[PDB]
Every structure is written in structure tokens, then in C-alpha cells.
Ligand binder design. Structure first.
Ligand SMILES: CCCCCCCCOCCOCCOCCOCCO
Ligand SMILES: CCCCCCCCOCCOCCOCCOCCO
Ligand SMILES: CCCCCCCCOCCOCCOCCOCCO
Ligand SMILES: CCCCCCCCOCCOCCOCCOCCO
Ligand SMILES: CCCCCCCCOCCOCCOCCOCCO
Ligand SMILES: CCCCCCCCOCCOCCOCCOCCO
Ligand SMILES: CCCCCCCCOCCOCCOCCOCCO
Ligand SMILES: CCCCCCCC/C=C\CCCCCCCC(=O)O
Ligand code: NA
Ligand code: NA
Ligand code: NI
Ligand code: NI
Length: 408
């Protein structure tokens, strides 16, 4: 939900990210549950990317009379992933990954009437993870990971029609009957809609941790509990070399997430897998801007917001070479209209997914996945404006998998 991204692997994409704490058919899942490291008996690599093509549209009419229509506000994106896992001994293993689990991009024309809450918002994050795991016995494994997150932001806001709203208010007041009041209203109305009123561009690192437990009933059936911590990102605004002769502030808290997962291989050729994930934020979505020495201070309201996601999928292990998968998911995000933001797509999301993997041999394989996401149409009440939003997306991904130390 919200800015969350689940796109850590292309096999996961084909399953609608169902039971991802409990499946370990490739290296990608260690990033989702570090305890899964104990399911690997040789160094294993995976890398790939997911292309996301959203279609998000805003509609409405301002109290000024101006249109709030904005089509196609969410651009396409590529989300890469790379994973490595290796055993150390019978009891221990480690892994590393580069993924993203948070990101946002919307863009409105700079003459948009709702520009004070529209403009541009681009948040990109890269999660570097190092994880370790311990196998206690045949049933129990435990994992712990540490995360370094590199976050880039670009945020711009514009006057839009605010001056027109002010002008109207002045004209409606007793001041509207005076020459001075009329002049003030004209001054307000004269403000260009593309006047920039807030700006942030920045790059910052933050840190967090994650952990996981894995319980195996047997080689065919297992369950997992995982936790991912919040990550706090604090954006803040030679000579040598000549041979002798970042703007804006914002504290952003990435959300914490708990997830339970199950995987049951009910037949040599069939598995089911499912999960419930619970995400909480310590901030609301809307932004307030002030300034200090001409630099923008952005602030989100400190408040508790949550969401949950349920997912169910199945994997058909057809033969030695071919695996097929499908899944369905629902991500429920119950944000009140008055707490939503046009700059941040947020709505209930329904997933339908399908995928396949082709294994060239026991060491090497390729995954291809596709998902369709249907977004709920929602009302948004932000600042002086009322909007409606509609959204959907297609996602396409491919990964290559390779396990080292071929021998026989
Ligand atoms: C009376 C003369 O001052 C009026 C202009 O000041 C308006 C205050 O501006 C609001 C700033 O925060 C609003 C965010 O868009
Ligand atoms: C639940 C957490 C319990 O698991 C702790 C055992 O994990 C093994 C070592 O912890 C991770 C160390 O490696 C991370 C640095 O690469
Ligand atoms: C309840 C909100 C108050 C009224 C809603 C605004 C609808 C009408 O406002 C139109 C704003 O246009 C700004 C032009 O300002 C007037 C300038 O010319 C008037 C000469 O005195
Ligand atoms: C590539 C990984 C290397 C980065 C490892 C650094 C990890 C250090 O950050 C751990 C602390 O993170 C803060 C957790 O957020 C608060 C909740 O947990 C705090 C309770 O101890
Ligand atoms: C024709 C069907 C014969 O193939 C049955 C085996 O299906 C392939 C899976 O092989 C079992 C081991 O691989 C599963 C571990 O991911
Ligand atoms: C798991 C991914 C879903 O795709 C499975 C496709 O196979 C359909 C059922 O398997 C064959 C049954 O149809 C044969 C008719 O008897
Ligand atoms: C036959 C010998 O060539 C093996 C080709 O396999 C491809 C190499 O595997 C990918 C390497 O990825 C490791 C990341 O550096
Ligand atoms: C409905 C569409 C909304 C667009 C923005 C979010 C789409 C990608 C979400 C990815 C994910 O939940 O893993
Ligand atoms: Na589009
Ligand atoms: Na319109
Ligand atoms: Ni709902
Ligand atoms: Ni050989």
C-alpha cells in the first residue's frame, strides 16, 4: 500500500507475492526472510528487474472553478533486484541483496490548479541488505539482517489557483466593497499558477534491521514470521583542485512490516503459498511546507496509519524444466478521504498474477512474471480541494538464477 513496493523478485511477481517468507525455490526470498538462508546448500545468485506501468488519473473541480483533471500522473519505473546467498557451515549461512521496498513518483503540469498539493514528487530508494542465519535443528531456523537505505527525493509544489481562492474570499468579505480590498484581491489573483512555492532535492542514507523465523514441518511444508523495522531518512539542505584558486528539509519514516507466510507442497507437482502482511506508518501522507532562510521545510503529520495485504498463490512444478505459477492478492489501505494525497497513489489494490520459470539445468534458470493491479477509485480531500482518483497498473519482470559449484 501507499509507497510500498513488493518487487524484490520476478518469481514472486508471478505468485502475486504470496507466502514469500516461506518459499525458497530461488535466492530472492532471503531478502524477504533471512531465516530462509538455511534452505540453501550452495552459493546461489539471482538478479533481474520489474517494469511497472501505472495508469493513475485525478479528477475534480476547484472551488475557484478551475479543473482538477490530471491524466496519467504516475510514470513508468524499473525496479532492479540482485541477491546472493551462501552457506558457511551446517548451522550458519549468509546473504546479501540489493532491492527496493519503497518508492513514489507522480507529476502534474506546473500550471495545474491544485499545484500546491500537486507539482512533482519523486522518491527513490535502494535497500542494501546483509543477512545471517542459524539453523537450530531440522525444524527451526532464525535470521537477522541489517539494511542500509539510500533515498533520493525531489519534491516541487506550485501556487496553482491559491491566489484565486484568496481573491474570492477577499471579494466576498466586507473588504470586497473597498478600493483597498479590491486591490489586494487583484494582487492575490495575479499570482502565476506556475509560481514555485516549495522545493526539496536531496540524497540521504538511513538504517534499519529485519528478522525472521522459519518452522519446517518437513521438507514439503513450512511457516514463517518476519519483521522489518522502520527506517528514518532525514533530508537536510577544492580549491585543491583549482591548484589553489541539496536543498530542503524533510524527515521521512519508512514503514515497519510484519508478515506471516505458509508454503505447502501438496503433491510432487503442486504447491500452495499464502501470507498475511501488516504494515504500519508513523506519519500521515499530506505535506505541510514552511521555510527557513528561503529553504523549504516539509513536514508530514505524526500519526498512526496501517494497511494489510493478503495473498494466495499456487505453483505447478510441471517437469524438470518448466514451472508455472499464479496468484491473487488484496492490499487493503483504509485511509480516510481527508488524509489522502493526490501526490501519493493510495487505494485498495487487487492483484492477479501469472509466471513461469525455465530451468536450463540444475544450476541455471530464468523467471518471467506478469501482474495486473486494479486500484479502487477513491475520494481525496486535501487542502481546499476535493478530488477523485482512479488507478491501475501492469507489472512485468524477469530474473536470471544461477547456483555455483556444478559438479558430479
Ligand atoms: C495579509 C498579508 O499576508 C497574506 C499572505 O500570507 C498568506 C500566508 O500564506 C500561507 C502559507 O502557507 C500556505 C501553504 O500553501
Ligand atoms: C530472530 C533473530 C534471531 O536470529 C539471530 C541469529 O542470526 C544469526 C546471526 O545474526 C545475523 C548476523 O549476520 C548479519 C551480518 O551479516
Ligand atoms: C467559498 C469560497 C469563496 C468564493 C469561491 C470563489 C469563486 C469566485 O472567485 C473567483 C476568483 O477570481 C479571482 C478574481 O478576483 C477578482 C478580481 O477582479 C475583481 C475586481 O474587483
Ligand atoms: C548493508 C547493510 C549494512 C548496514 C547495517 C547497519 C544497521 C544499523 O542499523 C540498525 C538500527 O536501526 C534502527 C532500527 O530502528 C528502530 C527500531 O529498532 C531499534 C531497537 O533496537
Ligand atoms: C511430467 C511430470 C514429471 O515431473 C515431476 C517432477 O516435477 C518437477 C519438480 O521436481 C521435483 C524437485 O523440484 C522441486 C524443487 O523446487
Ligand atoms: C500453478 C499455475 C497455474 O497453471 C496451471 C495450469 O495447469 C492447469 C491444470 O493442470 C492441467 C489440468 O488440465 C488438464 C485437464 O485434465
Ligand atoms: C560453461 C561455463 O560458463 C558458465 C556460464 O554461467 C554463467 C555465469 O553465471 C553467472 C555469474 O553470476 C555471478 C555474479 O558475478
Ligand atoms: C493502482 C495503481 C497504483 C499505482 C502505484 C502503485 C503501484 C505499484 C505497487 C507495487 C506493489 O504494491 O508491490
Ligand atoms: Na499510462
Ligand atoms: Na475537469
Ligand atoms: Ni478497503
Ligand atoms: Ni558437468
Amino acid at each position: 500500500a501507499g509507497e510500498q513496493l513488493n518487487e524484490f523478485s520476478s518469481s514472486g511477481l508471478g505468485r502475486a507475492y504470496s507466502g514469500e517468507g516461506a518459499i525458497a525455490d530461488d535466492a530472492g526470498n532471503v531478502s524477504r526472510n533471512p531465516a530462509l538462508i538455511t534452505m540453501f546448500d550452495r552459493p546461489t545468485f539471482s538478479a533481474g528487474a520489474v517494469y511497472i506501468d501505472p495508469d493513475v488519473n485525478i479528477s475534480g473541480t476547484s472551488p475557484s472553478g478551475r479543473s482538477l483533471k490530471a491524466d496519467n500522473i504516475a510514470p513508468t519505473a524499473w525496479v532492479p533486484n540482485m541477491h546472493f546467498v551462501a552457506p558457511i557451515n551446517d548451522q550458519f549461512g549468509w546473504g546479501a541483496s540489493i532491492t527496493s521496498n519503497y518508492g513514489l513518483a507522480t507529476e502534474f503540469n506546473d500550471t495545474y490548479a491544485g499545484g500546491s498539493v500537486g507539482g512533482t514528487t519523486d522518491l527513490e530508494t535502494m535497500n542494501l541488505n546483509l543477512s545471517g542465519a542459524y539453523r537450530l535443528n531440522n525444524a527451526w531456523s532464525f535470521g537477522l539482517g541489517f539494511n542500509a537505505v539510500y533515498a533520493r527525493a525531489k519534491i516541487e509544489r506550485f501556487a496553482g489557483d491559491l491566489g484565486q481562492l484568496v481573491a474570492g474570499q477577499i471579494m466576498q468579505s466586507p473588504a470586497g466593497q473597498t478600493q483597498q480590498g479590491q486591490a489586494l484581491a487583484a494582487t492575490a489573483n495575479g499570482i502565476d499558477s506556475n509560481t514555485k512555492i516549495a522545493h526539496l532535492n536531496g540524497n540521504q542514507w538511513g538504517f534499519g534491521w529485519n528478522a525472521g523465523i522459519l518452522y519446517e514441518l518437513d521438507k514439503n511444508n513450512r511457516y514463517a514470521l518476519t519483521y522489518r523495522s522502520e527506517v528514518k531518512i532525514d533530508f537536510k539542505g577544492r580549491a585543491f583542485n583549482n591548484y589553489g584558486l541539496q536543498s530542503g528539509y524533510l524527515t521521512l519514516n519508512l514503514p515497519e512490516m510484519w508478515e506471516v507466510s505458509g508454503y505447502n507442497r501438496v503433491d510432487p507437482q503442486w504447491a500452495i503459498h499464502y501470507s498475511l502482511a501488516y504494515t504500519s506508518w508513523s506519519q500521515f501522507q499530506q505535506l505541510k511546507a514552511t521555510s527557513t532562510s528561503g529553504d523549504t521545510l516539509f513536514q508530514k503529520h505524526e500519526g498512526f496509519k496501517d494497511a494489510y495485504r493478503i495473498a494466495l498463490g499456487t505453483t505447478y512444478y510441471y517437469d524438470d524444466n518448466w514451472t508455472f505459477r499464479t496468484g491473487i492478492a488484496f492490499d487493503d489501505s483504509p485511509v480516510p478521504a481527508q488524509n489522502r494525497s493526490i501526490s501519493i497513489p493510495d487505494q485498495d489494490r487487487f492483484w492477479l498474477s501469472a509466471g513461469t520459470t525455465y530451468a536450463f539445468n540444475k544450476d541455471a534458470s530464468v523467471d518471467v512474471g506478469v501482474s495486473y493491479m486494479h486500484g479502487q477509485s477513491v475520494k481525496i480531500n486535501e487542502g481546499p480541494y476535493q478530488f477523485e482518483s482512479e488507478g491501475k497498473a501492469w507489472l512485468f519482470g524477469t530474473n536470471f538464477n544461477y547456483a555455483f559449484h556444478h559438479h558430479h
